[PDB]
């Protein structure tokens, strides 16, 4: 019965590819050729969150676009004030190994987890005055690569054991499970409406999931290497996946296929983090080549280089108000560009 | 600065705390521990030392060793091996009572992030390897081996085979042999760490 199932799967893949290619009436390039280019975008280092003594792995902006949380392997997750350079909090992490850090939209909660297979929850507004551990979310058999807060109660965590999970911080038990990936799920990004999310795994596939009943809606392929970054478009109708092959593409949910690719001859280092702008025109994609380019998400061309780091960047987040972008590289210096 | 003065004061106090913690965390020595599954990883320093990563620490002759027994991570090596770029020395353990360990050593000794990091090697299970050689020839594990089947020469050939997989002369493999019961492992780790510490100190001062 294996042969029949394999033939059915091959026919289904062929018909899916035919349907996807049948809707590509016009490419995005000949549509974006009508806009004048945005021109060179120059951003100066307005601030620098000095105070870290290890490699930076996360920089998540608050909903007020003033508080940024940075996580490092020194064992501390310092919460910064982006206007006055001040450090609001310094959470002592249980384990130095951290590759993701989440900031709740309401600002009360901070999530952080790494190689421990545990996504710990930190309560910023504790009555005792000190930040403490709220809920330790255990249950994964692989490293937690990305965790994002849907709301104050539910957090969607991406693990390295091919299992994107939806949690319940109140009870600490996985309410719903997402499965279907073969490689490590290295990235995750919730939609603006917090009803669905994408995930870019190590097997060069970005599958969008459904938060409610936990079933994959669409699957996207085209990357020849692992996906290190993923993030939704500002409109929620598209997303961009950062691959380790020095290329990032802009998939669309309505078109069910990639629209444009962001590649150049002179770039070979692997992308580490990607993010959009408030209007969605600028795509600040980090790189392992010590810089952090900005991509015109319509014209699909370079518009500037935020080369101000002495090592590879691991996170690049844009404020909720579009005011600034925080690039936290491995050299411990998180710079708040603008 | 109406009440932001106290905000700056808190920032300075916790920055001082961060600096103190950072300079107190540089005392410890990081030792990534690798090897095959059940390859004697947790039977080397049992005279000392206490699901994902497993961290173990012990003190030996005024040194705190951070021994990250990462052997419990059943995932891709590539996606989380850059977190150990700043490791002092990789401790590689190989069981001699059993090609997979050789492949792992080849992949890890020539890794992009481990160009200048010495990779110690612990050829373990001396007695078991000796009995296996006395009962079975090394052709089973090493078909290309061409020599008498005894303990010393076969062990030397295996050690040379592991060492020859190095391709960068900027690193040296501190090969060693243990009988799964000797306590000399701590001394070997200590002297290797002393050597690499001296090398790093000379590198920092513009001397190595």
């Amino acid at each position, epitope marked *: 019965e294996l042969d029949q199932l394999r033939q059915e799967a091959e026919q289904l893949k062929n018909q899916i590819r035919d349907a996807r290619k049948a809707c590509a009436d016009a490419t995005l390039s000949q549509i974006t050729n009508n806009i004048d280019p945005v021109g060179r975008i120059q951003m100066r280092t307005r601030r620098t969150l000095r105070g870290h003594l290890a490699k930076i792995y996360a920089m998540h902006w608050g909903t007020d676009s003033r508080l940024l949380v940075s996580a490092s392997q020194d064992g501390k997750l310092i919460i910064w004030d982006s206007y006055t350079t*001040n450090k609001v909090h310094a959470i002592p992490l249980r384990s130095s190994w951290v590759m993701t850090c989440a900031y709740a939209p309401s600002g009360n909660y901070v999530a952080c987890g790494g190689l421990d297979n545990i996504c710990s929850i930190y309560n910023l507004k504790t009555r*005792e005055g000190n930040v403490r551990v709220s809920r330790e979310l255990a249950g994964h058999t692989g490293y937690l690569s990305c965790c994002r807060f849907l709301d104050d109660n539910q957090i969607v965590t991406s693990s390295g054991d091919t299992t994107c999970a939806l949690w319940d911080i109140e009870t600490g038990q996985q309410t719903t499970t997402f499965t279907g990936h073969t490689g490590d799920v290295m990235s995750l990004s919730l939609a603006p409406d917090t009803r669905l999310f994408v995930s870019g795994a190590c097997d060069a596939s970005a599958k969008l999931w459904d938060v409610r009943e936990g079933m994959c809606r669409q699957t996207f392929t085209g990357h020849e290497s692992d996906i290190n970054a993923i993030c939704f478009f500002p409109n929620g109708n598209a997303f961009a996946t950062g691959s380790d092959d020095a290329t990032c593409r802009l998939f669309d949910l309505r078109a069910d296929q990639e629209l444009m690719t962001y590649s150049h001859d002179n770039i070979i280092c692997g992308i580490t983090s990607v993010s959009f702008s408030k209007s969605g025109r600028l795509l600040l994609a980090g790189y392992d080549d010590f810089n952090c380019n900005v991509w015109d998400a319509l014209k699909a061309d370079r518009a500037g280089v935020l080369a101000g780091h002495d090592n590879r960047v691991s996170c690049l987040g844009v404020t909720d108000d579009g005011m600034a972008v925080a690039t936290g590289s491995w050299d411990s210096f998180l710079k708040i560009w603008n | 600065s*109406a009440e932001e003065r106290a905000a700056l004061e808190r920032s300075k*106090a916790i920055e001082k705390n961060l600096k103190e913690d950072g300079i107190s965390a540089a005392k410890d020595v990081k030792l990534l521990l690798l090897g095959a599954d059940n390859s004697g990883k947790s039977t080397i320093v049992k005279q000392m030392k206490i699901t994902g990563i497993v961290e173990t620490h012990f003190t030996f002759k005024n040194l705190h060793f951070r021994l990250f027994d990462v052997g419990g991570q059943r995932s891709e090596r590539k996606k989380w091996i850059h977190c150990f770029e700043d490791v002092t020395a990789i401790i590689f353990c190989v069981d001699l009572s059993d090609h997979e360990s050789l492949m792992l050593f080849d992949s890890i000794c020539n890794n992009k992030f481990f160009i200048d990091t010495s990779i110690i090697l612990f050829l373990n299970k001396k007695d078991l390897f000796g009995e296996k050689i006395k009962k079975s020839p090394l052709t089973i594990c090493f078909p290309e081996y061409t020599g008498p089947n005894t303990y010393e020469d076969a062990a030397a050939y295996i050690q040379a085979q592991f060492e020859s997989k190095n391709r960068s002369p900027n690193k040296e493999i501190y090969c060693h042999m243990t009988c799964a019961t000797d306590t000399n492992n701590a001394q070997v780790i200590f002297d290797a760490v002393t050597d690499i510490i001296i090398a790093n100190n000379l590198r920092g001062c513009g001397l190595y």
Partner: single-chain antibody
Amino acid sequence: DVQLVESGGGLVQPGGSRKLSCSASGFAFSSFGMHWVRQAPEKGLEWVAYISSGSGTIYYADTVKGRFTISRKNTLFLQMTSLRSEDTAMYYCVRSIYYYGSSPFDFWGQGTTLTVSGSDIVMTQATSSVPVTPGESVSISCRSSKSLLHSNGNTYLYWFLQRPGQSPQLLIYRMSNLASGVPDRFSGSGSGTAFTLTISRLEAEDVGVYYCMQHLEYPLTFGAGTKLELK
């Protein structure tokens, strides 16, 4: 949970000495800059001193400087020396933290009674008694000598409610934000120079004495004190 108990009262002869100790238990004491606020038996509250986290800086009032010593085992100390005839009051130990979005003067100590035998910003509450019935809408207006809205946009007009026989509790801080554990019935207002603490659907637990507070700069001068009498 959070408690700031204290002791060290009793009759003190004029010109004598006494020790006031604030025993803060149940929270991270070392991260809070404890204040000290007193209140005459028939007058409004008045600031006394201030010690930061780790004793980095210690401030004092105009009539407090020199003869009072504030020091910090999870205990805050105040040293009473050369007690005049105006030192009689009830002394309140008040914790406070200052970061982005913080809630200064969140918890006030129970207080102990002590008895004896002009360049600052003054707080003026011209109204002294607003008689209202339960379920009605009331407003308590407090005025300022100089504008409190700083350059960053934050105005320092803290609102405190003191029920009869109870320690004061923060209700509205920064004239717009609302403190934790406070029902949405109380709502801050005001802009620039004049401030009001609007009350919506006033209940039987909202009756007491209000004390508008400024925090633009030291000393911390309280308002005159408005008593929201029932009916």
